[PDB]
């Protein structure tokens, strides 16, 4: 029997035109796909979370696919992943998403090289969290560091977990701090 | 133009269940929001009529996105909301009753129910529950619902966040009787 | 009895101005809230009808307090709200549309406008903007307004917070035209 | 010209019947009266806040009178005072309320002996704050320590201040930790 | 043992100024917090005396950490606080008045002022302003101040967060007169 | 100088367990934060390079405090963060990627892993979860973790809060395999 039971999902698309500076030619879009699932381990200590982590890869694929379909496969430049575990769970129940969300997303995207950044928390329902993103091909590209806030008002309830993926289309709208540029990426190790 | 958009958000919330027997089709509630500069922040402007008039165009934009997102034949509930930044006043949000409501109803081919609403003057990041009801008859009990809106970094003190909401049906475990969609007979927008 | 009250709050908010010319009389918006045990928390109950029926009595209690507080002849706007604790479901709050609305309208001698509403399932301490409109005609534009409600330590997971709101008039700097109280002519509850 | 301009006021009355224990014969009522006023010093450093503090005594009297009229003069057993200053102000703009709110309230109440407890903060509009209360005749009466949350959704705006007084009618609903009792008060110094 | 510690936090806040002429030395306020299991969560326990007794050692632990952090000779203000998880009750935090206060006063060589306090029953992540006053005379007007405490993931429903606060001086721009440190003469803990 | 510090906070969070078998030694995560005036609040400044350069010394200050708090030989995870006040912009926080990261890495003798980060433009009191990872190899799965930061009264609209985080080890009940500290072999800062 599946360990994955979805109560609700949210898709958010934030389009930023400017931040009071000269507007860029095209706006930035950052998008998050979230799913609220029952936590099969809430309220007890389970030493073996490996089966759960394995099955969650399919959830990763589902959410990542939705994001590509939303933004367009050719438009992805930044990503992230995140988890919010309900108060009857533990951090480790969210930590399964590093592999499940990250690997699934990277596979959907043709295996870009940058590690997918992440943030997670154990929190009360409605908790809002800033999710950091970076460039999919080289984590050090300075223009692309950014953030989007995620959260669902009534989730995760104590015995639930909220899993999320984030994708975006470009650089900060007024990026102007130099550093490594897309054109300067030369190692192709996922960093520089 | 009195309308200068900094950012927009589109939210689609799909509910499969709420721990009861899952309905055949999930519910989708969607919100389309725009954060704009408040041209009147920091002073008392006696005439907000031109602003209210022009805002209808923002209503059209947002409503059009919602219909494109959910499908025109799939709309059953709606709402409108405004959050005014702390340097503004409530009246700056009140303009949206007409601007958002009339624009959305026009987009939808003039359904009869008044569009429900909520508004506040608040700090950036304020989150607000937005109530929805049935577009053809406000009293259809199965359809009363809510969705939370908000943007983390908005409205900043001299901004306004305007939003519209559309949805596809009843609460996932609606079971409290009352007037049903099918029983609607007066067509006055209530019953 | 399905109604076990832990605590109640009564809030009266008097607004003198919002940085414009102060009206002759300030506006008062008041909310009366009750936190009760949710008899259905933690399970799916198919029949919420008895609960909805009994809750009318809670509606009467709260509405009566509001009228006693503001004065019966001074009521111009109203609303109703519910916040369900995290172990409950939205349907547990939905019972209040009838229970709170009908009870309040009865207390007020059956004004014609549907009582507006908002609800959520939320954590203890959740705060919610509650929209109000004119009791005799929902379209009276001057009267659309809001008040925030909430109780710091409620609803706890197995509780429900039910609330009613009454107010004494228009927004303090209402100036957006629309249908006025005086122009009300249809008496259908809208116009 | 007056330094006191009120935008809005709130009166809250919280009645507690129980906290899942055996209910007391009469419920506890805790009430807060708040006023949101313009801050005449927002955005600058003013060395002399003494005139403002002096005039604010009248605001203290107004709010304290409202509370007695609400709860009944014969029913008061606990109190407190609090201030929330908008973000363009400073803590000192709230600190004026120790004297202005405290002394005014004590005078309205016939000069009970216990110092009025207090809390204050400089915060964003909508900030919610727990206000602690204690027994008006002897601060150490253990049964009476309690709290009520105050706040106004849209206040204080940056250039405003929210001032508040609190009064209440008795002990915690399930007080059971011994300590100094009302009957044991014998020094009458405001402590014991 | 009735004391099972999940996590602890120590926070030291240094204030150089608040947009006025900076004082000679900055103010430091420090909070030491401990999150523990609530042995009584979910039931009404009439006898909390053994718990209150045992908590004295937790008071001593937190107080000793604060003295070791700021330096015994530098302490001029203090406070105590408790946040109880939502499955508990207020009385579960009330035990800290004696356990925290007496332990801290003992550690500090019995200063005379009553330790001020604030408490709440709240959801995980609740943030609370904690008021401090002068350790030798509660009326010393320059010393009234506050610090915010809270832990993001605590107290969970079956936990309690207990905290102590110490600080090194007056508000950075204290200028409202009243009783001064130097004018203290009663030594009753008030004046 | 473009750096004017109003206040600083140091927080050390000690985790003994998270309801599982407690590890041999607890985890400590520490955050060092500084609230400064935003020299650019309210205007678009095209050249933020001098500010970014000058901020390096603030990075060194905060990093040195963290090493002195936890001990240089005990550091295994780090992060950096910024919260910009509402009158600023995101770019005002973005300067901290280099200023914070490079300063901290220098203090730590140049560990290879990129310092993770998160930033926001927000209202005073905004709380933010900050993610950490292993300082020698970002992929070490046991070490991914987070700590919440924030100051109640900061950043005010014309301020910025800059922060660094260091920690001493893995999650208290890390058990998901993946790359281990011991298996690190590339030394590129990833694996
Ligand atoms: Cl990854
Ligand atoms: Cl409408
Ligand atoms: Cl109704
Ligand atoms: Cl006093
Ligand atoms: Cl005591
Ligand atoms: Cl004490
Ligand atoms: Cl960098
Ligand atoms: Cl770095």
Author numbering:
A (entry chain B), D (entry chain B): 1 to 192
B (entry chain A), C (entry chain A), E (entry chain C), F (entry chain C): 2 to 192
Lines from the paper:
To extend the structural coverage of proteins of unknown function, we targeted Pfam protein family PF06684 (domain of unknown function 1185; DUF1185) and determined the crystal structures of two representative members. Despite lacking any recognizable sequence similarity to other protein families, both proteins show significant structural similarity to proteins with a Bacillus chorismate mutase-like (BCM-like) fold characterized by a β-α-β-α-β-β core that includes a mixed β-sheet (order 1423) with the β4 strand antiparallel to the rest. The biological unit of both proteins is a hexamer and analysis of homologs indicates that the oligomer interface residues are highly conserved.
The BB2672 gene of Bordetella bronchiseptica, which is a causative agent of infectious bronchitis in domestic mammals, encodes a protein with a molecular weight of 20.9 kDa (residues 1–192) and a calculated isoelectric point of 7.1. BB2672 forms a single domain composed of seven β-strands (β1–β7; residues 6–16, 28–38, 78–85, 118–122, 129–135, 146–150 and 160–168), three α-helices (H1, H3 and H4; residues 50–71, 92–95 and 97–108) and three 310-helices (H2, H5 and H6; residues 73–75, 142–144 and 182–184). BB2672 contains a central five-stranded mixed β-sheet with 12734 topology that packs against helices H1, H3 and H4. Analysis of the BB2672 crystallo­graphic hexamer reveals a trimer of dimers, with two distinct types of dimerization interface created by an extra N-terminal strand and a β-­hairpin insertion between strands β3 and β4 in the core BCM-like fold. The more extensive interface, which is located at the C-terminus, contains a network of histidine and salt-bridged residues that may indicate environmental regulation of hexamer assembly. Proximal to this cavity, a highly con­served cluster of four histidines, His93, His98, His144, His174, is located within hydrogen-bonding distance of residues involved in the formation of intermolecular salt bridges. This clustering of histidine residues in regions of some conformational variability and the proximity of salt bridges involved in oligomerization suggests that assembly of the BB2672 hexamer could be modulated by pH or salt concentration.
